[PDB]
Design an enzyme around this catalytic site. Structure first.
Site, PDB file in Angstrom:
ATOM      1  CE1 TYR A 105       0.079   7.442   2.346  1.00  0.00           C
ATOM      2  CE2 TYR A 105       0.801   5.256   1.687  1.00  0.00           C
ATOM      3  CZ  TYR A 105      -0.179   6.093   2.198  1.00  0.00           C
ATOM      4  OH  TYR A 105      -1.374   5.561   2.582  1.00  0.00           O
ATOM      5  CE  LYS A 143      -4.136   4.535  -0.022  1.00  0.00           C
ATOM      6  NZ  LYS A 143      -2.715   4.318   0.356  1.00  0.00           N
ATOM      7  CG  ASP A 150      -1.941   1.174   1.101  1.00  0.00           C
ATOM      8  OD1 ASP A 150      -2.952   1.045   0.361  1.00  0.00           O
ATOM      9  OD2 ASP A 150      -1.641   2.219   1.710  1.00  0.00           O
ATOM     10  CG  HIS A 155      -4.831   9.401  -0.432  1.00  0.00           C
ATOM     11  ND1 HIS A 155      -3.479   9.517  -0.578  1.00  0.00           N
ATOM     12  CD2 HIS A 155      -5.050   8.897   0.812  1.00  0.00           C
ATOM     13  CE1 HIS A 155      -2.897   9.054   0.499  1.00  0.00           C
ATOM     14  NE2 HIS A 155      -3.833   8.647   1.377  1.00  0.00           N
TER      15      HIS A 155
HETATM   16  N1  LIG Z   1      -5.897   5.914   3.266  1.00  0.00           N
HETATM   17  C1  LIG Z   1      -5.430   6.695   4.225  1.00  0.00           C
HETATM   18  O1  LIG Z   1      -5.844   7.812   4.405  1.00  0.00           O
HETATM   19  C2  LIG Z   1      -4.356   6.141   5.116  1.00  0.00           C
HETATM   20  C3  LIG Z   1      -4.020   6.786   6.287  1.00  0.00           C
HETATM   21  C4  LIG Z   1      -3.032   6.238   7.080  1.00  0.00           C
HETATM   22  C5  LIG Z   1      -2.404   5.077   6.689  1.00  0.00           C
HETATM   23  N2  LIG Z   1      -2.723   4.474   5.557  1.00  0.00           N
HETATM   24  C6  LIG Z   1      -2.039   3.236   5.193  1.00  0.00           C
HETATM   25  O2  LIG Z   1      -2.190   2.294   6.245  1.00  0.00           O
HETATM   26  C7  LIG Z   1      -0.904   1.899   6.724  1.00  0.00           C
HETATM   27  C8  LIG Z   1      -0.878   1.447   8.173  1.00  0.00           C
HETATM   28  O3  LIG Z   1      -1.462   2.377   9.061  1.00  0.00           O
HETATM   29  P1  LIG Z   1      -0.530   3.236  10.014  1.00  0.00           P
HETATM   30  O4  LIG Z   1       0.533   3.878   9.235  1.00  0.00           O
HETATM   31  O5  LIG Z   1      -1.388   4.127  10.849  1.00  0.00           O
HETATM   32  O6  LIG Z   1       0.151   2.170  11.002  1.00  0.00           O
HETATM   33  P2  LIG Z   1      -0.408   0.845  11.706  1.00  0.00           P
HETATM   34  O7  LIG Z   1      -0.553  -0.273  10.745  1.00  0.00           O
HETATM   35  O8  LIG Z   1      -1.553   1.148  12.598  1.00  0.00           O
HETATM   36  O9  LIG Z   1       0.840   0.488  12.635  1.00  0.00           O
HETATM   37  C9  LIG Z   1       1.176   1.375  13.678  1.00  0.00           C
HETATM   38  C10 LIG Z   1       2.496   0.970  14.301  1.00  0.00           C
HETATM   39  O10 LIG Z   1       2.426  -0.371  14.719  1.00  0.00           O
HETATM   40  C11 LIG Z   1       3.757  -0.858  14.844  1.00  0.00           C
HETATM   41  N3  LIG Z   1       3.737  -2.308  14.641  1.00  0.00           N
HETATM   42  C12 LIG Z   1       3.592  -2.939  13.476  1.00  0.00           C
HETATM   43  N4  LIG Z   1       3.606  -4.265  13.647  1.00  0.00           N
HETATM   44  C13 LIG Z   1       3.767  -4.499  14.951  1.00  0.00           C
HETATM   45  C14 LIG Z   1       3.874  -5.684  15.815  1.00  0.00           C
HETATM   46  N5  LIG Z   1       3.812  -6.921  15.315  1.00  0.00           N
HETATM   47  N6  LIG Z   1       4.024  -5.480  17.125  1.00  0.00           N
HETATM   48  C15 LIG Z   1       4.094  -4.257  17.655  1.00  0.00           C
HETATM   49  N7  LIG Z   1       4.012  -3.137  16.936  1.00  0.00           N
HETATM   50  C16 LIG Z   1       3.849  -3.197  15.603  1.00  0.00           C
HETATM   51  C17 LIG Z   1       4.596  -0.127  13.816  1.00  0.00           C
HETATM   52  O11 LIG Z   1       5.842   0.311  14.340  1.00  0.00           O
HETATM   53  P3  LIG Z   1       7.241  -0.215  13.738  1.00  0.00           P
HETATM   54  O12 LIG Z   1       7.387   0.386  12.384  1.00  0.00           O
HETATM   55  O13 LIG Z   1       8.257   0.336  14.674  1.00  0.00           O
HETATM   56  O14 LIG Z   1       7.114  -1.680  13.782  1.00  0.00           O
HETATM   57  C18 LIG Z   1       3.709   1.034  13.372  1.00  0.00           C
HETATM   58  O15 LIG Z   1       4.346   2.297  13.471  1.00  0.00           O
HETATM   59  C19 LIG Z   1       0.007   3.062   6.376  1.00  0.00           C
HETATM   60  O16 LIG Z   1       1.366   2.679   6.281  1.00  0.00           O
HETATM   61  C20 LIG Z   1      -0.539   3.444   5.017  1.00  0.00           C
HETATM   62  O17 LIG Z   1      -0.046   2.545   4.019  1.00  0.00           O
HETATM   63  C21 LIG Z   1      -3.684   4.974   4.777  1.00  0.00           C
HETATM   64  C1  LIG Z   2      -0.561  12.115   6.906  1.00  0.00           C
HETATM   65  C2  LIG Z   2      -1.433  10.920   7.281  1.00  0.00           C
HETATM   66  C3  LIG Z   2      -1.333  10.645   8.800  1.00  0.00           C
HETATM   67  C4  LIG Z   2      -0.216   9.707   9.235  1.00  0.00           C
HETATM   68  C5  LIG Z   2      -0.156   8.443   8.462  1.00  0.00           C
HETATM   69  N1  LIG Z   2       0.124   7.287   9.004  1.00  0.00           N
HETATM   70  O1  LIG Z   2       0.165   6.150   8.154  1.00  0.00           O
HETATM   71  C6  LIG Z   2      -0.500   8.573   7.022  1.00  0.00           C
HETATM   72  C7  LIG Z   2      -1.041   9.673   6.492  1.00  0.00           C
HETATM   73  C8  LIG Z   2      -1.354   9.714   5.030  1.00  0.00           C
HETATM   74  C9  LIG Z   2      -2.812  10.001   4.729  1.00  0.00           C
HETATM   75  C10 LIG Z   2      -3.256  11.243   5.473  1.00  0.00           C
HETATM   76  C11 LIG Z   2      -2.971  11.128   6.976  1.00  0.00           C
HETATM   77  C12 LIG Z   2      -3.669  12.278   7.807  1.00  0.00           C
HETATM   78  C13 LIG Z   2      -5.104  12.643   7.415  1.00  0.00           C
HETATM   79  C14 LIG Z   2      -5.328  12.802   5.900  1.00  0.00           C
HETATM   80  C15 LIG Z   2      -4.553  14.085   5.480  1.00  0.00           C
HETATM   81  C16 LIG Z   2      -4.755  11.504   5.239  1.00  0.00           C
HETATM   82  C17 LIG Z   2      -5.270  11.528   3.819  1.00  0.00           C
HETATM   83  C18 LIG Z   2      -6.577  12.325   3.834  1.00  0.00           C
HETATM   84  C19 LIG Z   2      -6.782  12.856   5.273  1.00  0.00           C
HETATM   85  O2  LIG Z   2      -7.357  14.181   5.222  1.00  0.00           O
HETATM   86  C20 LIG Z   2      -7.866  11.984   6.002  1.00  0.00           C
HETATM   87  C21 LIG Z   2      -8.292  12.493   7.349  1.00  0.00           C
HETATM   88  C22 LIG Z   2      -8.535  11.607   8.278  1.00  0.00           C
HETATM   89  C23 LIG Z   2      -8.915  12.048   9.487  1.00  0.00           C
HETATM   90  C24 LIG Z   2      -9.076  13.403   9.818  1.00  0.00           C
HETATM   91  C25 LIG Z   2      -8.818  14.322   8.881  1.00  0.00           C
HETATM   92  N2  LIG Z   2      -8.428  13.875   7.609  1.00  0.00           N
HETATM   93 NA    NA Z   3      -2.894   7.151   2.985  1.00  0.00          NA
END
Ligand SMILES: NC(=O)c1ccc[n+]([C@@H]2O[C@H](COP(=O)([O-])OP(=O)(O)OC[C@H]3O[C@@H](n4cnc5c(N)ncnc54)[C@H](OP(=O)(O)O)[C@@H]3O)[C@@H](O)[C@H]2O)c1
Ligand SMILES: C[C@]12CC/C(=N/O)C=C1CC[C@@H]1[C@@H]2CC[C@@]2(C)[C@H]1CC[C@@]2(O)Cc1ccccn1
Ligand code: NA
Ligand code: NA
Ligand code: NA
Ligand code: NA
Ligand code: NA
Length: 318
Positions: free
Chosen positions: A50, A79, A45, A112
């Site tokens: 990013y 995205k 993903d 996105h």
């Molecule tokens: N569509 C969107 O708007 C959006 C927004 C946010 C994220 N995303 C996608 O979703 C992905 C994941 O979400 P997220 O970035 O919030 O993180 P997450 O998957 O909730 O993970 C949070 C933390 O968990 C830790 N972790 C992972 N595996 C573990 C394990 N087995 N035991 C203990 N800790 C563990 C990691 O630290 P370490 O790295 O130190 O292991 C990571 O920083 C992102 O990378 C991105 O690709 C999409």
């Molecule tokens: C920077 C960011 C937080 C850290 C991170 N960890 O994996 C990944 C990202 C990338 C996607 C970002 C996100 C923050 C929130 C953003 C900017 C989102 C996309 C669209 C959105 O507006 C969605 C939203 C949700 C909740 C409230 C307000 N807005």
């Molecule tokens: Na994202």
């Protein structure tokens, strides 16, 4: 372990999350994306936003050229960022991601976010007070340009992210709809389990893909440090000890057993290899009910900036 999308393509139910905060060197995304593939991740993903598609692409190209995987074994997600909603901007945005990643196609292209921003050089276009400038775009016109991307073979599947039910219905009820979104990628974890939206997506044959499924990276700029820490949850911790797994593995397995496709970001070699252990054990029905009880409608990410956007997806919570 894949799910059949509503366009006949297949999505692996575990995905590798590639986002790392800007302070993390870009070299890491190449290193850990190769480790993820070695450990057995096949769904990767990423996104324009990013700033890592060059490195994630290069990890994928590397593991194909080394004979580890074939292109068709990898499910790559990119995205469309919110500055590229205007329909004429969509295909050049995808072509730009494909050029950076050096792939011929993405398996999945998402909108996105429904919260359109003003076009420009800047990915966060801001006024003199750092207030983000919004754009008014009918996302049905954005969706029609996504559909053309699929017809061009540049995206195998198309879907959306951060949409609420009303915004999904806007696409589902679009006159002349050709392609339903295959998925809605949303914040989903035991403190925000999105049970109603999940049922709605199931009824429309849209896959819910969970982000922050392990409780987010808790970055200060986005996440209140006072928010409860998911992986310290006493029920998750007690279930980890019961199964001799880890709270992270309980949180991931919860999503699998409820028909959610789950992402898991880790930049740590041991945790990357640990997370594929989700296929190795099962929660009981009683375990599932106890995790369901943790729900508190807690989104980790907050932005008063975006709270005011007309397309704010949480917009009518209170
Ligand atoms: N569509 C969107 O708007 C959006 C927004 C946010 C994220 N995303 C996608 O979703 C992905 C994941 O979400 P997220 O970035 O919030 O993180 P997450 O998957 O909730 O993970 C949070 C933390 O968990 C830790 N972790 C992972 N595996 C573990 C394990 N087995 N035991 C203990 N800790 C563990 C990691 O630290 P370490 O790295 O130190 O292991 C990571 O920083 C992102 O990378 C991105 O690709 C999409
Ligand atoms: C920077 C960011 C937080 C850290 C991170 N960890 O994996 C990944 C990202 C990338 C996607 C970002 C996100 C923050 C929130 C953003 C900017 C989102 C996309 C669209 C959105 O507006 C969605 C939203 C949700 C909740 C409230 C307000 N807005
Ligand atoms: Na994202
Ligand atoms: Na509606
Ligand atoms: Na928060
Ligand atoms: Na809210
Ligand atoms: Na309100």
């Amino acid at each position: 372990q894949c799910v059949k999308l509503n366009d006949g393509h297949f999505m692996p139910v575990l995905g590798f999350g590639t986002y790392a905060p800007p302070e993390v060197p870009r070299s890491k995304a190449l290193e850990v994306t190769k480790l993820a593939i070695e450990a057995g991740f096949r769904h990767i993903d990423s996104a324009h936003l990013y700033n890592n598609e060059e490195q994630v692409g290069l990890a994928i190209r590397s593991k194909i050229a080394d004979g580890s995987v074939k292109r068709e074994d990898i499910f790559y997600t990119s995205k469309l960022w919110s500055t590229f909603h205007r329909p004429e901007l969509v295909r050049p945005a995808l072509e730009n991601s494909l050029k950076k990643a050096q792939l011929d196609y993405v398996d999945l292209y998402l909108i996105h976010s429904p919260m359109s921003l003003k076009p420009g050089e800047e990915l966060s276009p801001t006024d003199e007070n750092g207030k983000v400038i919004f754009d008014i775009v009918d996302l049905c016109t954005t969706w029609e340009a996504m559909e053309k991307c699929k017809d061009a073979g540049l995206a195998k599947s198309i879907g959306v992210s951060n949409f609420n039910r009303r915004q999904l219905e806007m696409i589902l009820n679009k006159p002349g709809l050709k392609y339903k979104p295959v998925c809605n990628q949303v914040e989903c974890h035991p403190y925000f389990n999105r049970s109603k939206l999940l049922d709605f997506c199931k009824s429309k044959d849209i896959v819910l893909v969970a982000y922050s499924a392990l409780g987010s990276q808790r970055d200060k700029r986005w996440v209140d440090p006072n928010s409860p820490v998911l992986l310290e949850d006493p029920v998750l911790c007690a279930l980890a000890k019961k199964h001799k797994r880890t709270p992270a593995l309980i949180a991931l397995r919860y999503q699998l057993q409820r028909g959610v496709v789950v992402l898991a970001k880790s930049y740590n070699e041991q945790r990357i290899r640990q997370n594929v252990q989700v296929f190795e054990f099962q929660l009981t029905a009683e375990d599932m009910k106890a995790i369901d009880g943790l729900d508190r409608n807690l989104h980790y990410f907050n932005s008063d900036s975006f709270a005011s956007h007309p397309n704010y997806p949480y917009s009518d919570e209170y």
